[PDB]
Structure formats: structure tokens, C-alpha cells
Paper text:
Adenosine triphosphate (ATP), the fuel of life, is produced in inner membranes of the mitochondria of eukaryotic cells by an embedded molecular machine with a rotary action, called ATP synthase. Mitochondrial ATP synthases occupy the inner membranes of the organelle and form dimers via specific interactions in their membrane domains. Each monomeric unit in the dimeric bovine enzyme described here is an assembly of 28 polypeptide chains of 17 different kinds, organized into a spherical catalytic globular domain that extends from the inner mitochondrial membrane (IMM) into the mitochondrial matrix, attached to an intrinsic membrane domain by a central stalk and a peripheral stalk (PS). This membrane-bound enzyme is a machine that transmits by a rotary action the potential energy of the transmembrane proton motive force, generated by respiration, into the catalytic sites in the extrinsic domain.
The dimeric enzyme, inhibited by residues 1 to 60 of regulatory protein IF1, was purified in the presence glycodiosgenin, Brij-35, and phospholipids, and its structure was determined by cryo-EM of single particles. As it rotates, the asymmetrical central stalk brings about structural changes in the three catalytic sites, found mainly in each of the three β-subunits, which alternate with three noncatalytic α-subunits in the spherical extrinsic domain. These structural changes lead sequentially at each catalytic site to the binding of the substrates ADP and phosphate, followed by the formation and then the release of ATP. The inhibition of ATP hydrolysis in the isolated catalytic F1-domain arrests the rotary cycle at the catalytic dwell, and in structures of the inhibited bovine F1-IF1 complex, the rotary cycle has been arrested at 27° to 32° after the pause in the rotary cycle preceding the release of phosphate. In the current structure, the postphosphate release angles are 28.8°, 26.2°, and 25.5° in states 1 to 3, respectively. Therefore, the rotational angle in the F1-domain is not influenced significantly by interactions with the additional components of the intact enzyme that are absent from the isolated F1-domain. The PS is an essential component of the enzyme’s stator linking the α3β3-sphere of the F1-catalytic domain to the membrane-associated wedge and the adjacent a-subunit into the stator subcomplex against which the rotor turns. During catalysis, it prevents the dissociation of the α3β3-domain from the central stalk by clamping it in position from above, and it resists the rotational torque of the central stalk, preventing the α3β3-domain and the rest of the stator domain from following the direction of rotation. A cap provided by the N-terminal domain of the OSCP is linked to the N-terminal extensions of the three α-subunits and adjusts its connections in concert with the rocking of the α3β3-domain during a catalytic cycle.
Author numbering:
A (entry chain H): 15 to 146
B (entry chain I): 1 to 47
C (entry chain Q), D (entry chain P), E (entry chain R), F (entry chain O), G (entry chain K), H (entry chain N), ...: 1 to 74
I (entry chain L): 1 to 75
K (entry chain G): 111 to 219
Write the structure that this text describes.
Amino acid sequence: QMSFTFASPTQVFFNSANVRQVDVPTQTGAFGILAAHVPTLQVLRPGLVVVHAEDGTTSKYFVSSGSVTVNADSSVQLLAEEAVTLDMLDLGAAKANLEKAQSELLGAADEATRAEIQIRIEANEALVKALE
Amino acid sequence: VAYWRQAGLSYIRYSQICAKAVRDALKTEFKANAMKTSGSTIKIVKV
Amino acid sequence: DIDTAAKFIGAGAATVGVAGSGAGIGTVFGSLIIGYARNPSLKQQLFSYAILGFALSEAMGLFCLMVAFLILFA
Amino acid sequence: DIDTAAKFIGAGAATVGVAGSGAGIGTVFGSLIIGYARNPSLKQQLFSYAILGFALSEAMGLFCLMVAFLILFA
Amino acid sequence: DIDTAAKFIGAGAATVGVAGSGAGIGTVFGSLIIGYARNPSLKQQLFSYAILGFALSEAMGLFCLMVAFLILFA
Amino acid sequence: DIDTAAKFIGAGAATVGVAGSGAGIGTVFGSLIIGYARNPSLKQQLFSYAILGFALSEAMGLFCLMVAFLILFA
Amino acid sequence: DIDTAAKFIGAGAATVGVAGSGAGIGTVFGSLIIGYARNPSLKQQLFSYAILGFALSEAMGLFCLMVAFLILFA
Amino acid sequence: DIDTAAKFIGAGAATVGVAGSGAGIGTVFGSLIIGYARNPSLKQQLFSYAILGFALSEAMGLFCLMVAFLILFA
Amino acid sequence: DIDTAAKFIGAGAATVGVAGSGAGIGTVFGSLIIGYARNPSLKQQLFSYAILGFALSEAMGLFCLMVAFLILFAM
Amino acid sequence: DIDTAAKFIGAGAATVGVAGSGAGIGTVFGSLIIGYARNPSLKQQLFSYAILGFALSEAMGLFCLMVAFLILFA
Amino acid sequence: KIRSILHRTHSDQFLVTFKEVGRRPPTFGDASVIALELLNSGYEFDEGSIIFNRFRSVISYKTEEKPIFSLDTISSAESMSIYDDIDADVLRNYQEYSLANIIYYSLKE
């Protein structure tokens, strides 16, 4: 079966747990991991991981970044740099930050700043799309 | 390549910026309980 | 007579178009297999797309067979 | 008549091209699924592509039938 | 006779419709291989969709065969 | 006119060739969807290549309809 | 007899169906390569699908060859 | 009359062959779309082999047009 | 004649059947290309699996090629 | 004479299958594009397999055209 | 302290060093800073080791060393053949993150 390990640097949510399916975002493309998924390495994108226990229960944790590894022996390791449960967020702050970022992206101070603002944009965009 | 790398950013920077965003977008209560254990005090010395 | 000859030729050669509808159904359902073997969580939205693609694809074969019927009956 | 017979012959081979359309639509309505599996954060924006991928996909289909029209009555 | 030749040629030029159906079967069972190979646990579920696509796509080629036999023997 | 009938059957055979362009455009505009799903940031390049290939494949369908007219008329 | 000729006409215009077969088999044994390269571990169960699909599509294509032999010899 | 009728019909048969080149051209310009989405930093390098595939798929269509002209005029 | 000449078109319309075999073998070898690109370590086995799909598709085409050459010679 | 007419028709029908070779070549080169984008380092070996498969599908298509040439001339 | 103890022999080999460690508890931000200042420094290291003091128990610690690699090693490591969707983009972004992870783990230990 699947041995899950979801752990922010600050806190650990699952330690070698046994869940049925886990849906995770990713740079390439958001996808799901099941009890025999082929081994892969990926680095997460601002999104929301969704876990389902052996039963039909669910849980959604919004993750900023990180890396998800699926190993030969069916062991998923989802190390997220900042993993927060949805009940910790507020809409207006994220929405205003997103709109501010869109406003400032017009100001092409430099390509590095353009990229930084773009990252902030789609970060807050995933936040709102999760909360809207 | 990705839209955030043409400039030349490392994925560390990508995660750092995304994490700062997700921190900024928390409850007013959890801001006090997350602003700590989030900053950085290390500083570099010229070689 | 030769009029019936052309009738039968047309009926026979019109139905061949249904091959495209068959291939469309095949490719759409293969895409469903792949896109549900990637992100199974959805499904409750993918199968909708697969069924819509079925309707749309089998429409072409239906058209070809109705053309065959009309050319062999009027 | 031989003329009507040739009209029918051309009609039979004027509706075969619809198979092309049959494949076309399918491919798009295959790819969409794949795409929508790998990136549910572009669903809506994908629809536009899909409808475009439908119109120009069925386009030739209809035009093939157009020839049939002509080859039946022109 | 011209009419009997008509029926036989109609059957012959209709039977080709199976090509698209065969291509669709091949596409479906290639998609199944890839999908299962990525995510083996989903097997018995992917298999249902893929075999369903098989049968529910070869329905078109069998419609072509049925119309061919209709023309030949009727 | 036997020769006008031969022109008609030639046009009926020729008009099918656009099925190739239909299939090609289906492939192009499904690849567009999935590639845009993978790498949205480059939408403008995706349209550029997609439309370039679209016309560049419509080459064949326009050729086939043109030759249908030419056998019919010229 | 004009039937003795239209028989061969139909046989030739019917054996073309094997094209779609060949294409389906090709797709299946390409998809097998991708699937096995991606996930070499579960080698065997890939065959339980590859051979199944190949033989299945090959048989449904051979239906057209069977029909062609039937008409050419009956 | 029948000789030029054969001219017309055989040319119309030849004109169909460009459909496969249409399918292949669409395939190559969908593959370029994908391969550019996945590794954008290899534009021109990918484009070189893409235009090579253009040339080697246009070969078939232009040869089919060549044979069509030859058999309609020689 | 007609029945001694219609065999020519019979054979031609049978020989058209090889197009799909050509397409199938093309996609087989494209799949070989992609498979090798993914896992270049598996160079040996992939070629064998190719040869297999190669042979099966080309034989399926040979069926129609022989049907045509039957039309011309064995009718 | 009708023999020459049937001979033209046979050649024109046989010279359409190179559509298959065109589609196969297009698919092979699309796969080349994708594989190269996957692994830019390995292009020679990818190109080696690509030229082998290319040339062999070329052999099949040109074999079809050789049969067309023969039937026109014999 | 590490810089000083090794500024007599191996004085020249220093590439960069950091201060204000341990004054306050370390955080993933500190590890990210170290990883950034390592990657940006134009040194294309082909291998590495990280030495730290694993905390066995309140009485004992062990000077442990963990290896670390580079994307050029990962690509050419045949053992990676069984991991899919592995180009030279996700693989080395993952390598950057792995470097930051190991730095943070060593900091905490």
C-alpha cells in the first residue's frame, strides 16, 4: 500500500500514513498519486493538495511550494515549504495582494522583478481560486 | 525554463516568494504565530 | 438499370465515411483513459466530456449512414 | 440516366471526406480531456479552444457535403 | 447483370468502413496501456472504460458491415 | 454525356482528399490544447505555430477542392 | 460477366479496409513501447493488454479480408 | 470517350493521395507545438527538423499531384 | 475485354490497402523514438519490440498485397 | 478500347496509398520532435532510429508507387 | 567559529561563510539563504558533503556527514531511469530544493 509523508518544515501532517489517493499540484501538471503510481519526482506549485484516507474522507491543505517524490516501494513524500489548512486564510488580503501585483506588473522595472511579481500574482491567484 | 526563470531565478527563490505570499494571506490571528519561525537572520561575509 | 447501379455505388461509398466517426470515438475514449489515469479525482467532469465527444463523433457516422439511406431510397 | 448515375457516383465519394471530420473532432475532443486532466486551472479558457477546435474541425465536413450537393444538383 | 453487379459493388465499396473502427480500437488499447502503465492501481477501472470504448466504437464498423450485408443480400 | 459523367465521378473521388487536412487540423488544434495546458505562458507562440500549421495543412484541402472544380470546369 | 468483373471491383475496393487495421496495430505496438519504457517494472501485464488489443483489432480487420475472399470465391 | 473518361477518373483517384500527407503534416505541426511547450528554449533547433518533416511529407502530396497531372494528360 | 481488364482495377484497389500499414509502421517507429528518448538505457529491448510490431503490421499489409496479386494472376 | 481505360483507373487507384506513407513519415518526424525535446542530449541515436523508420516507410510508399507504375505500364 | 578554526590551514579554500548562526533558532529562511548564496556563487561543484552534529541524546551527539550531488550526477545516474517525467528542469529544481532541505535539517540537528 501507499506510505504517505506530508511534512512542512515547521509541522508534520502525515508520517508514513496510509492514505488511498492523494491529489497534488505540480509544475508540469496537477495529478493524482495512488497506491502503485509509477515513480516520479516533481516540484510543487502554489496550489492545494487533497488527501483521501483509506476510507472516503478528504482533507485539503494549501501548499506554497515543495517537492513530491513517489518511490519504487510505493512511498510518497510531499515536502511542502509552507503547508497551511484552508481555514487559516482570508480572502480580502489575498485578493488585494493579487490586484496590486497585477497593477505593478505594468511597471517593468526589470525582468527579475517581472518574474517575482508574476510568481506573487499566480500564487495569490491560486489562493483565490481555492477560496473563491 | 519557466516564466519565473527567464530572468534567472532559482527554484529556491520561487518557493521563497510563494511562501511569503501564503504567509501574507493568513488570518489576523495566525499572522503573529507565523511571522516568527519564518524570517531569516543569517548574513554573509565577504571572502 | 444503370440508374440502380449508381444508386448502389453511392449507397456503398457513402457509408465508408463512418470510419472517421469510429476513429473519433476511439481517440476520444483513449484520451479519457489517459486523462483519468493521470488525475482520477475528477472523472465526474471527464466522463461528461467523453460522452459529449461520443455524441459529437457518432454524429458524423450517423450522417453518413443517413446519406446512404437517402441515396438508396430516394 | 447516365448523368444522374454519375451524380450519384460523385455523391457517394463526396460524403467519404466526412470521415476526415470524424477524426478531427475526435482528436480535439481527445486532447481537451488530456489537457483538462493535466491542468484543471484552465478549464473555462480551454472551452474556447475546444469550440474553435470544433468549428474548423467540422468545417471541411460540411464543405464535403457541399460538393455532394453540387454533384447531385450542379 | 448491371443490377446484381450493382449490389456486389455496393457491398465491396461499403465494407471498407472497418478501417476507421480498427484504428479506433488500436488507439483505445494503446491509451489503455499507457494509462495503466502510469497508474497501475487504477487497472480494473481503466479496463472498464477501455473495453467499453472498444465495443462502443466498433459499433460503427459493425454498422458499416451490416449495411454492406444489407446491400449484398437486400 | 459519358465524359461529363466521368468528370463527375472524378470530382467525387477527388473531393475526399480534404479529409487529410481535416485530420491534420484536428491534430494541430488538439496539440495546441494540451501544450497550452503544459506551458500557458507561451500562448502567443502557440497561436502562431497553430495557425501557421493550420493554413499550411489547409493547403491540401484547398488543393483537392480546387482540382475538383478544375476537373469539373477546366 | 459484368458481375464476374464487379466481383473483382468489390474485392479490390473492400480489401482496403485492412489499412485501418494496420494503423491500429501500429498504434498499439507504439503505445506498448512508450508504456513499457515509462514503467519497465510491470512488464508482463503490459502484454496482457498489448497482445489482447493487437489480436482483437487484427481480427476485426481480417473481417474485411474474410468478406473479400467470400465474394471473390462466392 | 472512354479513354478520356479513364483519364478523369484515374486523375480523381490520384488527387486523393494528398490526404495522407495532410494527416502527416498536421501530426508534425502538432508535435512541434508540444515539443515547444515542453522545452521552449529549443525553438529553431526543433523548427529545423519540423521543416524537414514538412519537406518529406510534401514529397508525397506533390508526387500525387504529379501522377494526377500525368494520368489526366498522359 | 472487361472481366480480363477489370482485374487491373481490382488489383489497384487492393494495393491501396497498404497505406494504413504504412501509417501503422510509421507510428510504431515514432513510438520507438519517444520510448528511447524517455529511457535511453532500454536500447536493446525496445528495438526487439519494434521488430515485432513492424513484422505484424507489415504482414497485415502483405495480406492485401497478396490479395491484389491474386486478383491479377490467381483471380 | 476499354482495356486501356480500366488500366488508367487501376493506376490511379493504386497511386493513392502513398497517403499512408505520408502519414507515417509525418508521425515519425513528430515523434522525433517530441523525443528530442524530451532529451536534447540524445539526438543522433534518436535521429538514427528516425532515419531508419523514415526510410523504411518511404520504401513502403514508393513500393506502392512502383505498383502504380507497373499497373499503368502493365 | 568554524571559519576561525579553519582559517590557518584551508584558509584559502573558503568560498563563503555566514554569521549570526545560533543566536536565534534557525528557520527554513536561513537554509534558503545559504542555498541561494551557494548556487549564485559561480562554483559548479560536482559533489559535496555536509558535516553537522546529529543530536543522539542530551549527553551524546555524533558528527555525521551527509552527501549531496549535482544535476549532472543525477542525470547520468542510471538509477534515475525508473523515475518518469524527469527532464533537466524538474530534476534540478528538485535538486535545489533538496539542497535547501538538507541545509535546514543540518541546521536544526
